[PDB]
Amino acid sequence: PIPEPKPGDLIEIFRPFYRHWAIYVGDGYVVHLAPDILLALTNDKERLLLGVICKVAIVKKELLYDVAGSDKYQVNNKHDDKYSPLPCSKIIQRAEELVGQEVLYKLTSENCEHFVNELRYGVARSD
Amino acid sequence: PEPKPGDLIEIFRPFYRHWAIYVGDGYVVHLAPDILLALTNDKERTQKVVSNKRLLLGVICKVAIVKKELLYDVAGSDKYQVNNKHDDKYSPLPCSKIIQRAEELVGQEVLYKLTSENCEHFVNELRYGVARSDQEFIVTD
Numbered sequence: 001p002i003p004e005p006k007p008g009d010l011i012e013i014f015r016p017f018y019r020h021w022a023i024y025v026g027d028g029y030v031v032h033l034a035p036d037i038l039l040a041l042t043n044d045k046e047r048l049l050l051g052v053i054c055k056v057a058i059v060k061k062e063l064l065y066d067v068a069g070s071d072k073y074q075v076n077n078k079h080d081d082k083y084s085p086l087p088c089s090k091i092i093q094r095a096e097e098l099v100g101q102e103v104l105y106k107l108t109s110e111n112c113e114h115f116v117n118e119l120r121y122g123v124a125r126s127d
Numbered sequence: 128p129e130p131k132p133g134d135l136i137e138i139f140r141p142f143y144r145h146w147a148i149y150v151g152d153g154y155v156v157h158l159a160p161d162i163l164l165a166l167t168n169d170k171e172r173t174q175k176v177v178s179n180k181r182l183l184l185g186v187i188c189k190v191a192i193v194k195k196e197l198l199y200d201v202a203g204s205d206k207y208q209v210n211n212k213h214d215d216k217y218s219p220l221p222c223s224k225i226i227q228r229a230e231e232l233v234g235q236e237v238l239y240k241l242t243s244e245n246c247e248h249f250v251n252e253l254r255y256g257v258a259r260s261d262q263e264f265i266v267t268d
């Protein structure tokens with residue numbers, strides 16, 4: 001068949017409707033930014049302050065074989081012509097660190113208040 | 128007792144306080160919750176279609192949008208007050224400047240694009256250390 005990826009290789013997965021990217025980190029595993037959609041209403045403290053948390057993605061570490069499923073993929077380090085990749089041991093160290101990190105927005109009344117204060121005064125308060 | 132242009136309005140909704148800024152003639156500008164997932168179609172191949180498969184860039188998660196609406200509609204049946212809370216700390220901007228800046232933001236959205244491109248920026252940042260603009264929800268220009 002086709003040789004295994006090397007550590008640090010970018011993987012482009014051809015899903016039926018879209019292309020999914022990941023990075024190889026060794027021993028069968030990739031790190032990738034995966035969809036993880038959750039909306040939750042919460043009660044912050046400090047009368048409670050109602051809030052809305054929207055999570056849309058999370059960085060995961062999973063086996064390439066599971067992420068690819070039945071979809072085909074290729075190694076595609078297509079920016080090696082213009083950027084230096086980092087040393088491969090550094091790439092994987094940095095990838096492992098991000099695992100569990102989430103993309104999320106927290107919406108409370110504070111956001112709206114900072115928004116209008118910025119218009120009235122030109123000032124972003126830090127409380 | 129009508130608000131003046133540039134006045135901050137605090138609306139007492141049953142579970143939270145909703146803020147707005149008065150811009151004149153019955154209207155406020157405010158950041159309104161508008162929570163939406165929408166699929167976003169792949170356009171790159173638009174003018175050079177060879178399958179009929181609809182292709183996707185990704186999904187957009189929108190959380191809020193800046194609107195301009197009538198105070199009467201935004202308040203609904205909730206009570207509200209003028210509350211220029213920090214006038215004792217520093218002075219407001221000139222009132223015409225406040226309204227100019229408020230009108231310009233109308234239509235801006237708070238969102239995150241979970242797209243191929245975004246994921247490619249993420250892995251590029253790991254492989255090359257090239258920093259990225261997009262790792263978090265953004266506000267559009």
Ligand SMILES: *C(=O)CCCCCC
Nearest residue numbers: 020021185186242246
């Ligand atoms: C990144 O490659 C993940 C993009 C997922 C889009 C889901 C619609």
Ligand SMILES: *C(=O)CCCCCC
Nearest residue numbers: 050051108112145146
């Ligand atoms: C801004 O005033 C809107 C804030 C919405 C809070 C929802 C919990």
